[PDB]
Design a protein around this ligand. Structure first.
Ligand SMILES: Cc1cc2nc3c(=O)[nH]c(=O)nc-3n(C[C@H](O)[C@H](O)[C@H](O)COP(=O)(O)O)c2cc1C
Ligand SMILES: Cn1nc2c(=O)n(C3CC3)nc(C3CC3)c2c1Cc1ccc(C(F)(F)F)c(F)c1
Ligand SMILES: O=c1cc(C(O)O)[nH]c(=O)[nH]1
Length: 371
């Protein structure tokens, strides 16, 4: 609650990244709040054998380097997507690179995959997994890893392969980021043919980790599921019916475990304070766009591919809209920026309360209910 006093200050006066680094730093030293209450079993959700204690996680780009996993999750989230990571560390584009307009509760960013690199982040998650093994409050929480290419890498597959070999065995799922606007030509790989080759290589590389073991599978996968990481793809709102039916076909043929919808958009033009700035736009103004993209991709894939919702989710209603559109689970980013800690507690009660008034035995009853 006290942090919500701090927030309205950090938003008025302080740069975003400085506020970001402070929040990560508070969590590094375990001085963030904890939600220790039972989540409604009536709101759990799943994607194949991934069982989510609740339908809300933290989107990629929040804990890029996995230095703050414990404390953020202990805040009341069921899972977190770290990354996007690249094989070697990158500083990203030139600072300043994140801007926020409170009036529209929106953000624009051109970070450019700044991270300390796979090797160092993997060591951070190894440490986390050892703490998770000992703490019940973290015992059922899922950690996925978002992976992308270095800015100057020519072949994306080569970057994706390296990450899997090094970190694949500690992740519960892998998110393929082909949708960042701030990496040049990165959304050209969303093309159907290259995407197929990428996908099938990701799934194949994961499959090879199993085969060359002398140990059991309990000991191979040092993660919550103690299982092979799933393979998800983060699609961009910057697609088109054609290219959305191109990709949908690839997804159907390659048996992708799920698709994350969506990344930021480069199509919001009515924000006065962000005019002439570069980067992708996040937040509420992306909500309706993202929801429409869920409907299309949920429809184009005949409901066979689970959808992970992302984009402008702030309230319980917003989440239910994503869920009723076809999403199984939701990810938050901007909501945490503008609402802070309460975000998880608040959105979970709103969703539970709304499920009660609108008549649902459980959450799965609501998935895709607009269709
Ligand atoms: C500052 C910032 C950094 C982000 N970094 C990443 C990233 O590294 N990898 C990724 O896949 N998505 C990244 N995203 C996209 C978000 O995860 C999410 O898809 C999008 O911002 C929608 O979130 P919203 O709920 O705030 O609207 C980033 C977004 C922002 C605002
Ligand atoms: C106000 N605020 N601005 C943010 C921002 O710009 N980003 C990035 C552009 C992506 N991320 C976050 C969130 C993870 C921090 C921002 C927050 C929440 C916030 C809460 C509390 C404090 C503290 F004072 F308790 F430490 C703080 F410093 C910041
Ligand atoms: O997927 C992504 C990545 C970035 C970034 O790291 O710059 N930014 C976004 O808006 N989306």
């Amino acid at each position: 609650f006290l942090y919500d006093i701090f927030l309205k200050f950090c938003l008025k006066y302080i740069d975003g990244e400085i506020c970001h680094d402070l929040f990560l730093l508070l969590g590094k030293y375990n001085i963030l709040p904890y939600d220790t209450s039972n989540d409604s079993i009536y709101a759990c959700t799943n994607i194949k054998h991934l069982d989510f204690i609740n339908p809300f996680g933290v989107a990629a780009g929040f804990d890029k380097n996995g230095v703050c996993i414990d404390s953020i999750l202990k805040l009341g989230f069921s899972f977190i997507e770290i990354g996007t990571i690249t094989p070697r560390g990158q500083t990203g584009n030139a600072k300043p690179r994140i801007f926020r307009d409170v009036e529209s509760r929106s953000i624009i960013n051109s970070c450019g995959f700044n991270n300390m690199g796979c090797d160092k982040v993997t060591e951070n998650l190894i440490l986390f997994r050892k703490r998770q093994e000992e703490d019940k409050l973290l015992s059922k929480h899922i950690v996925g890893v978002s992976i992308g290419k270095n800015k100057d890498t020519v072949n994306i597959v080569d970057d994706l392969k390296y990450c899997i070999n090094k970190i694949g065995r500690y992740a519960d799922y892998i998110a393929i980021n082909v949708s960042s606007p701030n990496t040049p030509g990165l959304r050209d790989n969303q093309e159907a043919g290259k995407l197929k080759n990428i996908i099938l290589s990701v799934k194949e590389e994961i499959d090879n980790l199993e085969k060359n073991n002398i140990m059991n599978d309990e000991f191979l996968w040092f993660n919550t599921t103690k299982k092979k990481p799933l393979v998800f793809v983060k699609l961009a709102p910057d697609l088109n019916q054609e290219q959305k039916k191109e990709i949908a076909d690839v997804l159907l043929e390659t048996n992708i475990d799920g698709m994350i919808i969506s990344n930021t958009t480069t199509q919001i033009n009515d924000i006065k304070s962000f005019e002439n700035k570069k980067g992708g736009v996040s937040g509420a103004k992306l909500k309706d766009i993202s929801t429409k993209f869920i409907c299309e991709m949920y429809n184009y894939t005949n409901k066979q591919i689970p959808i992970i919702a992302s984009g402008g989710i702030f309230s319980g209603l917003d989440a239910l809209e994503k869920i009723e559109a076809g999403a199984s689970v939701c990810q938050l980013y901007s909501c945490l920026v503008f609402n802070g800690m309460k975000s998880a507690v608040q959105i979970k009660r709103e969703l539970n309360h709304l499920l009660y008034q609108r008549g649902y035995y459980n959450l799965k009853e609501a998935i895709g209910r607009k269709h």
